[PDB]
């Protein structure tokens, strides 16, 4: 499926997870940010690449990136 990569510039604001319509991201404990939270993608096989997480990222550039490629039944959003 698609590739979801999260960098260290994330501030743990949990906006990307709330904007996710397929429950791909998660919040794990961290020490590199003030909020002590870091975004993770343990369910990247269910991500369709809608880039809704990138819209909700408040940091400049993007702390979360979605790269398309190798579309599957789950990645193409097919009910059939």
């Amino acid at each position: 499926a698609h590739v979801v990569k999260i960098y260290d510039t994330c501030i743990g604001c949990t906006q990307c997870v709330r904007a996710c319509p397929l429950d791909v991201l998660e919040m794990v404990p961290w020490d590199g940010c003030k909020a002590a939270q870091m975004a993770s993608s343990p369910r990247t096989e269910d991500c369709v690449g809608c880039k809704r997480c990138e819209t909700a990222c408040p940091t400049d550039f993007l702390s979360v990136r979605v790269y398309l490629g190798n579309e599957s039944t789950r990645s193409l959003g097919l009910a059939y």
């Binding site: 510039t9 940010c33 003030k34 408040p58 940091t59 400049d60 550039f61």
Partner: protein
């Protein structure tokens, strides 16, 4: 700890981050975190980016004086 880990709050800074929207731009320091995070320098900018935000966190090595 001694002095402060970053620049003086409220002072103008120039962002040296190349991938940032505010590269070679002047912003105002809001607060500098002292716990030891990667990007403690909170900078507020007068002009918003395409996402509409105006604040970002930068590290110590990507801020200089306004020339």
């Amino acid at each position: 700890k001694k002095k402060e880990v970053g620049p003086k709050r409220g002072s103008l800074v120039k962002v040296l981050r190349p991938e940032s929207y505010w590269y070679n731009q002047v912003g105002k320091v809001v607060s500098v975190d002292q716990s030891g995070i990667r990007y403690p320098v909170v900078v507020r900018f007068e002009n918003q980016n395409y996402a509409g935000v105006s604040t970002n966190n930068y590290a110590l090595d990507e801020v200089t004086d306004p020339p």
